[model samples]
Target: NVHELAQSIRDGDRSALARAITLVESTRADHREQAQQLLLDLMPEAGSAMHVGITGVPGVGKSTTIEALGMHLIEAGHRVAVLAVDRMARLAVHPDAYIRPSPTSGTLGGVAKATRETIVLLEAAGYDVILVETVGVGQSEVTVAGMVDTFVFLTLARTGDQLQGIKKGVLELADVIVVNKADGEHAVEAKAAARELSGAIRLIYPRESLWRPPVLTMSAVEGTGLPELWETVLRHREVLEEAGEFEARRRTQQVEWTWSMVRDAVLDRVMNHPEVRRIRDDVEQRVRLGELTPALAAQEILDAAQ
Candidate 1:
């Protein structure tokens, strides 16, 4: 059943692909078992795809860029799948409650959940290239980076001190840095920003990844420089291959994913413990009132759980 449906998906059966992904990402216990079996069956064919993670602040046109890039990859004969991690779309690529540009008008965490699910589904559906778009939360960039083969950090041309604050950590994680909205009036500024960022990246990360950090300029709307962006990614892949780091990195990613699930399970169990739940409200109150230290409360909770 698993191999047949997976082959159907590979043959362009979208519904079959969708169901496979839903089963994989589902939190339900039975679904997880089914998902594991499917993954095990598909393992030999799965990691052939290039996994890319992209993120930028809100209003940077991440979705539009992704749609364009997805089309470009498809034209290049690469099957593409997009997962949004920074902001969520009501449905993946649809307008829904968690639509891009933020329907909640708040932060990007809530938006990320739905898109992340879409990515997993896309991968299982036989997409040769999986693009995971990130939620623009300040600190959560690493979360998406942790899930992909390459990470792209996108930003506007005018980022100065703002760039300084977010760029350091983001740059540390990104395989490529794109200065977006580089056309029309902002062309010169965008070019300058790109050069400056390139220099900054070099100064900071003297020791680089398979591909040294590239500061490319692109108009996500007009689709300029997208080809070059794609080339940069391919070149990075080549570097990883040459250095013999590609498969090793992938094995590490699998290990990390397994540990991440275990960690989440442990935390969930801790939270659901009867004593922990019973004193949860009171613990918060005591912490807020400065009567009990959070550290002390946590230790007591752990002891009680035991």
Candidate 2:
């Protein structure tokens, strides 16, 4: 049945593909076994697509820009897929388009696991460009950055100074940066914002670095600057490829992904353990009361786990 499902998925049957996505999203043991088998069979067809990630603070036009950018990619004859970190949309109607919610159900690790597997299924279904859009939250930003080939970050001109440390890591993870919603009267402000960010980035990145992210201003509604943004993504890929960092980058990510899963499994087992549950409830209460150190509480949990 899984092989049949894989065959149907290869032929772009949405029903089968949807089932495959569901299988991967499932936490049940039997479902996970079938999901692994499905992915192993589809692995050869996967990894052939462009993996780009988009992230920005709330209200920065991330979705609108993604909508515009995806249409643009589709227009250029690329089959596009969107891995929305949460909530599906109407884009499922397009023949060359695929969009699905991330089902960020349990831990961030769980969401990451679901996403990486879904990326495999989508690529096998003939999608050439894969875009992962993440909520601009802190941990999710880092998690998305770890999975994608090129990470594109969006921000607004008016919110230029909003770059705190959690926000600071975003620019640091990004391969490309865009100041969006830059059209109309805000274009001037966008221009100023980009210049300021350009200056701001130089302080963080040195000229000797292999690649320095260039900031651009864009109008997501008018679809302005999407072209150059994509081109920069391509150029970033090329730069990495030529320097031998592209393959190395993804290989390292794969390794990190492995360790991440290991940590997840360990934590899941620990949390589910009956004895660990007793310790968890006890230590959690102690920590809440400020009588026990957080480290000792954690040590008790680990002791109970092993």
Candidate 3:
């Protein structure tokens, strides 16, 4: 029975787990029920995994580094997974790994919301690590930091003196900042870059805070410092565990998800409007030109809802 799909996902039904993501990502009411049903039945089996929100600039070998760290961790005896905001070809080949691309037919804010659901499914099926790729300094990027225990931001030293190149807000969000691609001659540059990064941390970040982020260097291409990178996540968790923000973070994310879903309900009304947007475009300027009242203009789009 499709009813046992939850149990199927639990005892190693990988495709069922795969299809379950599709169900959750759908925009239909029946689909929503089946998907949330799988979730409600499995919530107890979930929540034991590690979550990291890895965000950074593009082309810093994010995909390469994730693949490397994933394999290195699996070889060290743990199953790993990706939330797949990036393209990872090799990690998809591993038997004990899972990677699911986010739901996106557009740059929908609500689209990123489904990833929290995927994290539960992957963890329910038995993954030790979950990398929710928070790729840039967008609202969604910070939104993901809420869902993860540690947020690791990757950077490059090639910019040399554009110390201003790194966003201060990024520094604030990252629990561990990694300067990647440090294998060749630039490894020394990476070490100094790491210094400048942490130095920059002290200049702007709160000195009295419970955990000041530590900067580290890694060469994802050559697999350097990946283990230490992993270690930093553990240290970050340990500190949060003592301060009592670890469970606090998880429970807060759940409450955040509750309100987040309510938004999608209101959001679905507008995006699914097949014929309204073109007319609504005219409706906006008409109101601006004082020809149409704002409330009447809004009624034009709302009355067209299916």
- Candidates' C-alpha lDDT: 0.69, 0.84, 0.80
Q: Give the alpha carbon lDDT tens digit for every residue of 1-306 in model 3.
A: 445888888887888887888887888999888878888888897688998888877777888988898898889888888884426777899988777676684444555657878788888888878888856654656677778889998888874443324665666778898988887777877888788777888998789989999989899988879999999999999999999888888998889878876886777778567767668778889999999999998888787765
Quote the positional error of residue 125 for candidate 3 in Å.
Answer: 0.9
**Candidate 1: clashing residue pairs, number:** 8
Displacement of the residue 297 alpha carbon in candidate 1, Å: 2.7
Cα lDDT of model 2 by residue, 1-306, tens digit = 989999998998888998999899998999999999999899788788989999887788888888888888888999999986632243566678887776856777788889999999998989989999887664888888888999998887664454322375667888888888788876877888788888988987877999999988889889889898989999999999999988788889999999988888877898889899777777899999998999988888888988
Model 1: per-residue Cα lDDT over 194-283, one tens digit each:
888887777776574446888898987799999999999898888888999988888887677667667766787787899898988888
lDDT of 2: 0.84
Error of 3 at 266 (Å): 3.9
Q: In model 2, which residue pairs have backbone atoms overlapping below 3 Å?
A: none
* Weakest ten-residue segment in model 2 by summed lDDT: 159-168
- Clashing pairs in model 3? none
Clash count, predicted structure 3? 0
Model 2 ranges off by over 4 Å: 86-92, 159-168, 271-298, 303-306
Q: What is the lDDT of residue 125 in candidate 1?
A: 59
